Amino acid sequence: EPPPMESPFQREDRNEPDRFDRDRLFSVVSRGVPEELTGLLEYLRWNSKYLTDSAYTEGSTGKTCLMKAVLNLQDGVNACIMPLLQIDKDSGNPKLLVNAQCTDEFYQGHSALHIAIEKRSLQCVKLLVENGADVHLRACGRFFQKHQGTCFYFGELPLSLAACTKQWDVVTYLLENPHQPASLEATDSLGNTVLHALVMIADNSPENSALVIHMYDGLLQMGARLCPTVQLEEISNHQGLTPLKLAAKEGKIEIFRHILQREFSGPYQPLSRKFTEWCYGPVRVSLYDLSSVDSWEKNSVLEIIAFHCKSPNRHRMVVLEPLNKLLQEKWDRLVSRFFFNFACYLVYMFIFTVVAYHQPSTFGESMLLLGHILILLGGIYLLLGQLWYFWRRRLFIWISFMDSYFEILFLLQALLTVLSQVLRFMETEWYLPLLVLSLVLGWLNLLYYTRGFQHTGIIQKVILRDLLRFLLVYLVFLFGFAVALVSLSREARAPYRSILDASLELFKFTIGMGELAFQEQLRFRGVVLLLLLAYVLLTYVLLLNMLIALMSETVNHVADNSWSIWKLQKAISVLEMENGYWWCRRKKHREGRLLKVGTRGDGTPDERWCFRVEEVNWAAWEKTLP
Amino acid sequence: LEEISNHQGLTPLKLAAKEGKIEIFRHILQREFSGPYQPLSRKFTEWCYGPVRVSLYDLSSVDSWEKNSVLEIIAFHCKSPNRHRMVVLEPLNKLLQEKWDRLVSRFFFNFACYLVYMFIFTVVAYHQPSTFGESMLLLGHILILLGGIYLLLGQLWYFWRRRLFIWISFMDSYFEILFLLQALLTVLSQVLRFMETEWYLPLLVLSLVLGWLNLLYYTRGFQHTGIIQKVILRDLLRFLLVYLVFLFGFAVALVSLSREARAPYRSILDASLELFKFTIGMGELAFQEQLRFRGVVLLLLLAYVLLTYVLLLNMLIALMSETVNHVADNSWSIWKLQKAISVLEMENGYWWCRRKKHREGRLLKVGTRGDGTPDERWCFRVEEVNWAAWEKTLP
Ligand SMILES: CCCCCCCCCC(=O)OC[C@H](COP(=O)([O-])OCCN)OC(=O)CCCCCCCCC
Numbered sequence A: 001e002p003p004p005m006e007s008p009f010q011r012e013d014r015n016e017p018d019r020f021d022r023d024r025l026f027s028v029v030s031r032g033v034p035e036e037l038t039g040l041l042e043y044l045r046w047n048s049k050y051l052t053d054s055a056y057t058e059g060s061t062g063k064t065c066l067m068k069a070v071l072n073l074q075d076g077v078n079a080c081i082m083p084l085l086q087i088d089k090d091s092g093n094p095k096l097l098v099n100a101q102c103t104d105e106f107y108q109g110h111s112a113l114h115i116a117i118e119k120r121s122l123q124c125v126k127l128l129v130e131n132g133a134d135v136h137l138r139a140c141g142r143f144f145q146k147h148q149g150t151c152f153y154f155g156e157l158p159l160s161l162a163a164c165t166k167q168w169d170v171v172t173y174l175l176e177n178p179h180q181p182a183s184l185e186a187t188d189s190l191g192n193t194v195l196h197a198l199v200m201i202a203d204n205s206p207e208n209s210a211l212v213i214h215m216y217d218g219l220l221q222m223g224a225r226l227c228p229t230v231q232l233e234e235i236s237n238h239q240g241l242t243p244l245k246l247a248a249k250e251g252k253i254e255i256f257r258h259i260l261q262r263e264f265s266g267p268y269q270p271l272s273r274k275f276t277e278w279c280y281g282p283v284r285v286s287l288y289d290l291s292s293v294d295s296w297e298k299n300s301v302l303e304i305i306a307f308h309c310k311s312p313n314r315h316r317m318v319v320l321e322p323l324n325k326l327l328q329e330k331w332d333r334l335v336s337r338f339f340f341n342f343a344c345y346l347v348y349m350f351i352f353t354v355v356a357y358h359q360p361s362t363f364g365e366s367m368l369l370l371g372h373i374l375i376l377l378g379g380i381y382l383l384l385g386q387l388w389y390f391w392r393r394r395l396f397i398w399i400s401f402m403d404s405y406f407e408i409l410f411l412l413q414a415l416l417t418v419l420s421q422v423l424r425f426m427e428t429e430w431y432l433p434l435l436v437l438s439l440v441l442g443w444l445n446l447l448y449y450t451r452g453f454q455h456t457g458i459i460q461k462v463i464l465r466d467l468l469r470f471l472l473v474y475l476v477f478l479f480g481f482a483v484a485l486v487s488l489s490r491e492a493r494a495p496y497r498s499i500l501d502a503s504l505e506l507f508k509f510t511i512g513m514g515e516l517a518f519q520e521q522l523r524f525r526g527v528v529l530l531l532l533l534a535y536v537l538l539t540y541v542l543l544l545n546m547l548i549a550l551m552s553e554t555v556n557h558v559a560d561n562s563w564s565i566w567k568l569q570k571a572i573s574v575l576e577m578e579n580g581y582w583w584c585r586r587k588k589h590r591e592g593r594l595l596k597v598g599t600r601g602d603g604t605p606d607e608r609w610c611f612r613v614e615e616v617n618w619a620a621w622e623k624t625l626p
Numbered sequence B: 001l002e003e004i005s006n007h008q009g010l011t012p013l014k015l016a017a018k019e020g021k022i023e024i025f026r027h028i029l030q031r032e033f034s035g036p037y038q039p040l041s042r043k044f045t046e047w048c049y050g051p052v053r054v055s056l057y058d059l060s061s062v063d064s065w066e067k068n069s070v071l072e073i074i075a076f077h078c079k080s081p082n083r084h085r086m087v088v089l090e091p092l093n094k095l096l097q098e099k100w101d102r103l104v105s106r107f108f109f110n111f112a113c114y115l116v117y118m119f120i121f122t123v124v125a126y127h128q129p130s131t132f133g134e135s136m137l138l139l140g141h142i143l144i145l146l147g148g149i150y151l152l153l154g155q156l157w158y159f160w161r162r163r164l165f166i167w168i169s170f171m172d173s174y175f176e177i178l179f180l181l182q183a184l185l186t187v188l189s190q191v192l193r194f195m196e197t198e199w200y201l202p203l204l205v206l207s208l209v210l211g212w213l214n215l216l217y218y219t220r221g222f223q224h225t226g227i228i229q230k231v232i233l234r235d236l237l238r239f240l241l242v243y244l245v246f247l248f249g250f251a252v253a254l255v256s257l258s259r260e261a262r263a264p265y266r267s268i269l270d271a272s273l274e275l276f277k278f279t280i281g282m283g284e285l286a287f288q289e290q291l292r293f294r295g296v297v298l299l300l301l302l303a304y305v306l307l308t309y310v311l312l313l314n315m316l317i318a319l320m321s322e323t324v325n326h327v328a329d330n331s332w333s334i335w336k337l338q339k340a341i342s343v344l345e346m347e348n349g350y351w352w353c354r355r356k357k358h359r360e361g362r363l364l365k366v367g368t369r370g371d372g373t374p375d376e377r378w379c380f381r382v383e384e385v386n387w388a389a390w391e392k393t394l395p
C-alpha cells in the first residue's frame, strides 16, 4: 500500500551537539518555527551527514525535510524553508536538497517544486527557483500517470502542472525568469509537451472546456514571443501525434473544435487556422488550414477519427468544419465508384444465383462450367480483398464492431464461396450446405450499399446489447427445463429423447415455429404439463421485462444522431475508397490550394494549404443586425 | 452524547440507518469541524493534491466486526426504499468494495461447487434405470443426498438468523427461499427413492428445474450481468385477480352448458385449464359443433377472448405509463446492495465452520479528547478523485 503524501495523524515510515534526528526535524518544519532549527547544522558537521541522507528522509518513499515544509504551508509561506536551504549549503551537501526527488514507485520524481505549484504559493515557487530549483524535473510515478483509480496526470512537469491547475501567475514566472527559464517544448516520459498535457486533462464538460481552451491559447501567444521560430503545435509525442491529432484520438471534441477553427485578429494572427475571406449577409466564406488534416498525408486526423478513435463522439467530429465539407467533396468525387462497386457486386450475385439455381444433381454445361469459374475467381477476389483490409485495419474492427460488421460478413461469404467450389472439385456432397449459406449471406450483404442513398442511409446498438443480456437468462431457462423433460421421459420408456432435441422443441415453440408435445401417453403427464406451463409463463415474464427495459431506455434517452452516424459511415467508406483496390492503388490527390496567408515568425512567407468553406447561416446573421 | 443507545440498543447513527433518514445519515457519517470542536467530527482530511482528496473516516459502530453494525442494520434491518442509496455513501462504498475484493474468490468458489453439484445431479438423473456402472450411480446418489442435506442445513441456519429480513425484503432474498425448496425436494426425493415409491420422480425433475434456475443467483458477481422487475410483479398479481374471475366465470358456464345436454368441457378444472392454455398460446379452443347450443358456446368463447384482450391491453398500458413517467437509474445502486447482502453473509462463513472477523481500519491518534485521553479512533482511509468539484474551486 502506498504511504500517504502528508498525514498529520500517521507518522512517516522509517523503512558534542545535541541530537537532531528526523522526527525532531520533521516536527519543526511542520510547525513553521525557524527558531528551533538551531543545532541542526552543528549536528550534520559533527557526524558528516547531510539533509538528503536516507536517515533524514522517509525510507518508504523518499520525502525530504524540505518537502515536509512545503506540504505544511501556513497561508502560503513557511518560515522554515529559507533556513533549511541555508543549512544544506553550509553542510557541504554534494546534492542539492532543492532538487531532491522521491524513489517510491507510486511517487517517483516528485520534488518540492511540484508541491509549491500545487499549493498555489507563488512566494514559495519564487523562493525555490532562486535557490536553484530545476524546472525540468519529471514526476514519473504511478500516481502521476493516467490510469484507473487514484491518479493525477498533469504532464509530469512543473510547467505543465501550473498550466493544468490554472495558475497563469506561476506559468508566467516559470517561463520568463532570470534564474532558470522553462521551455515550452519540454517532454515527459510519454513525450507529451505542455500542449499535449492539456488535451489529456480536457473534458467535454463546459467548465473544463473553458479552462483548457483559455490555457491553450495563452501558451501559444506566449510561445510566439519566447520561441518565435519553434512551432509548438507540430511537436509529436512518442506515438507521433500532434496536439491536434491527440485530441482526435482521445475524443476531446471541445478542444478539437477550437483547434480546428480558431481566428486571432491583429497580432498573433499566424497562430490561427481559420481565416475569414469575405462575408455578404448570411454568407460567410473562410479559409481553413488543412495541415495534418487532409487524407493525403499519412496518419491524418480523418484516418485517426475513423480508424483509431474509440470515443463515442467520433460521429460528431465528422460534422465540424472543415471536416464536413472535405468529406463531402471526397464523397462527390467517389460517388461514381461506390455505385460501380455496387453494380459489380450485384452482377456477381446474379451469376452466383443463376448457377446455383441451374446446377445438376454441351453448350448448357459449358456455360455452367464458365459460370463456376467466375464464381471461384469472384470469391478469391473478395477473399484477397478482405484479407488486405483485415491486415491494414485489424484494430479498428476490434474497437468498432457496429461500424464494420459487414467487413466480417464479406469475408465469411468469401470463405464459404471459395471452399464450396473446392469441395465441388473434391466431389463431396458437403459443398451444398456451404453454397446455400453463402447465397443467403451474399444477398444479405447488399444492405451495405444502402449508405450511398440519403433516404436509406440515414437504436440498433441498444437492441443488440439487451438481446445478449437476456439471452443468458433464457438459455438457463431453456437448458433447465429441457433436462427435466428428457429425464422424465428417459426413465419411463419421442419428442423429448435428448437434450438437443428437447431444447430445439422448446425453442421452436417460443418463436412460433412449432408446437409442444404434452406426452399424454406418459404416466406422469401432469408433471410434463406443469413443467411446460412453467416454461411458457417464465418465458413470457422474461420477454415482458425485455420489452419494458427496451421501452425505458429509448424513451428516456432522447437523441437524434441519424444524420451524424450516416456521415461517419460515408467517412469510413470514402477513406477506404481513396486507397483503391488491392490489385491497383490510386495516387492520393491533395485537397486545398497553397495560399500565402502572410508572414511567419521567422520571416518566411506563411504559405498554407487552405481549404475554402462557404457557410450560410441566417439565424446567426439576424442576431448581429442592430 | 452520540454513543447513548435507546431501549433497542441503537445509537443516533444506527437509528438513522434503520429508519432510513439518509440525509442526516450522510451528514453524521461524513462531518468535519475545523479548529474548535474538532473531536466532534468523524471525517478527517489527510491530504489533497488537485482533484485527489484523501480523508480518514471513523469506523466506530460502522465496521462489520462489531455486533449490530450499521452495515448489518442497512442490509438486514431496514425497510426504507433508500437502503440501496445508503450503501453508496462513503466510507460504506469503499468498505464494502474492499470486503468484496477479499471475498471475491470464495464467491466463485461457492459458484464452482454448486455447478459441480448440479453436474452430478444432472448426470445421475439422466442415467438412472426404470457392477461398476451401478456402484458409481449408487455413489452418485449418496453425493446428491449429502449435498441436499448440506444445502438444507445451510438454509435453515440462514433462516434462523435472518427471519425478519426476508419477510420485509422478498425481492432481495427470493433466491434464499428457492435454495431451501430445491434442498427440500432433493432430500425428500432420495428418501422416497429409499421407500421404493414412484412419487420420487415428480420431486426429482422439479428440483432439477429449480436447481438449474438457481444458478442465476451467482450473476451478481459479474458487473455486466449483475447491473423494473418490481413493477412487473406488482402489476401481474393485480391483474391476475381480474383474470381468475374471468377464467372461473366462463369455465362454469361452459361446463353447465355441456353437462346438461350430454368432452373438452366436462369439469371446472378441465375447462379452466383449456381456456388458460389457449390464452398463453399453448393450445386451441373446442367449439362443440356437435352440441345443440353451439351458437351459445361460440358467444361465450368470443366474449372470453375479447375480454381477455382488453384486460391484457390495460395491463400493457399500465406498465407503459409507470415506467415511462417514473424515470430513474438505480441499476448500479441496487447491484452494490446485492453485493453488500452477499458479502455480509460470506463474512460469517459456512455453518459448519465460522471465520473470525477481521477488523477493518487502522488505530490512529486523531488528537486529544475532551477528557484529556488521546483521541484514538479506527480510521479508514478513503481516496476520492473528483475533477468536477476541483475545477469549480479554481480561481
Ligand atoms: C487481379 C485483377 C482482378 C481484376 C478484377 C476486377 C473486378 C472489378 C473490381 C470491382 O469492381 O470492385 C469489386 C467490388 C468492390 O467491393 P466493395 O468495395 O464494395 O467491398 C466492400 C466491403 N465492405 O466487389 C465486387 O463487386 C465483388 C467482386 C467480384 C466482382 C467480379 C467482377 C464483376 C464484373 C461485372
Ligand SMILES: CCCCCCCCCC(=O)OC[C@H](COP(=O)([O-])OCCN)OC(=O)CCCCCCCCC
Pocket: B109, B110, B111, B112, B113, B114, B115, B116, B117, B147, B148, B150, B151, B175, B176, B179, B217, B350, B352
Ligand atoms: C459438515 C461438513 C460438510 C463439508 C462440505 C464442504 C462442501 C464445500 C462447501 C462449499 O463449497 O460451499 C457450499 C456452496 C455455498 O452455497 P452458497 O453460499 O452459494 O448459497 C447461497 C444461497 N443464497 O453451496 C454448494 O456448492 C452446494 C452444496 C453442495 C456442494 C457439495 C460439495 C461440492 C464439491 C465439489
